Amino acid sequence: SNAMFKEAINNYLHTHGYESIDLKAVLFDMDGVLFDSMPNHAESWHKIMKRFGFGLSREEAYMHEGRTGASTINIVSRRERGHDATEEEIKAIYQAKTEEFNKCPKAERMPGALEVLTKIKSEGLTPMVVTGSGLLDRLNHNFPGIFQANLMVTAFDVKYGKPNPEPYLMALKKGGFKPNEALVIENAPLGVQAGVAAGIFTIAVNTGPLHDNVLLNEGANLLFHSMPDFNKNWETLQSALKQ
């Protein structure tokens, strides 16, 4: 999409007051981008919330993809009960959800993910993982030598999660990058919102059940239809980004 890429790039540069994107880093969301883990996460959240007397559908779990467990629990609690959940409730729910997910731990790699990461690493770029998930052994086994511990952001690295820009800002800080030196690769509306709020060129890759518009409406600079789509377009995109 050569000319489409330039339009997105130039719009981003104009609205932020940059001369160019000087690409050094690519910040990947984990769930639904690196691993096809969302079906399990959505079902686990739905089932565990039901066990605790709360109604969270699989689809609403997708809408809340990236959000801290506490914020998700509190959204549902406030609306059903008119108050936030207690610390005790939140800890119990998260524990049950963790255990439930682990009944089926091994999410597949997303097709196209290992291939695109290898191209990015080959080019001298720094891949990073940014996740609201609470795994480097699992990452190592699936993406060998791609990611580094000092270059990852997880639920325990940061106070506020998506859609707060904090996870992505922490990624730039950890990696020593400026916002115009990175790309965010996201698959969920709250993830897209966080990347856009962090002022980094944000690419949506729709790997789930939601409409493209859900991602576009959060200000994604570009959208691909799948991780293989993203992978196939990497060469053209990196070229478009080089001034």
Annotated binding site for Mg(2+): 29, 31, 65, 187
Task: Tally helices (H) and strands (E) across the chain.
Answer: 11, 6
Residue 242 CB, shortest distance to Mg ion, in Å, is 28
| Pairing of β 152-153 and β 126-130 | parallel
Nearest residue (CB) to Mg ion, 71 versus 187? 187
How many CB atoms sit inside 10 A of residue 164's CB? 21
Query: What tokens does 149 get?
Result: 């511990």
Residue 173 CB, shortest distance to Mg ion, in Å, is 21
218 binds Mg ion (CB under 5 A): no
Applying CB under 5 A, which part among 79-87, 159-167, 182-190, 218-226 lies near Mg ion?
182-190
Residue with tokens 């963790």: 98
* Cα–Cα nearest to 152, from 138, 163, 164: 138
Distance of CA 96 to the CA centre of its chain: 23
Applying CB under 5 A, which part among 28-36, 54-62, 148-156, 161-169 lies near Mg ion?
28-36
**Integer Cα distance of 48 and 18 in angstroms:** 46
Residue 55 CB, shortest distance to Mg ion, in Å, is 22
29 binds Mg ion (CB under 5 A): yes
Nearest residue (CB) to Mg ion, 31 versus 180? 31
Query: What tokens does 116 get?
Result: 């695109």
201-205, strands of its sheet edge to edge:
152-153, 126-130, 25-29, 182-186, 201-205, 222-224
Cross-strand pairs, 153 = 130
Residue 32 CB, shortest distance to Mg ion, in Å, is 4
Size of the site for Mg ion (CB under 5 A): 5
Among 8, 32, 40, 56, binds Mg ion (CB under 5 A): 32
Please give the residues from 137 up to 156 whose contact with Mg ion meets the rule CB under 5 A. none
- DSSP code at position 110: P
Nearest residue (CB) to Mg ion, 31 versus 218? 31
Residue 95 CB, shortest distance to Mg ion, in Å, is 22
Among 187, 202, 206, 221, binds Mg ion (CB under 5 A): 187
Task: Point out which residues bind Mg ion (CB under 5 A).
Answer: 29, 31-32, 187-188
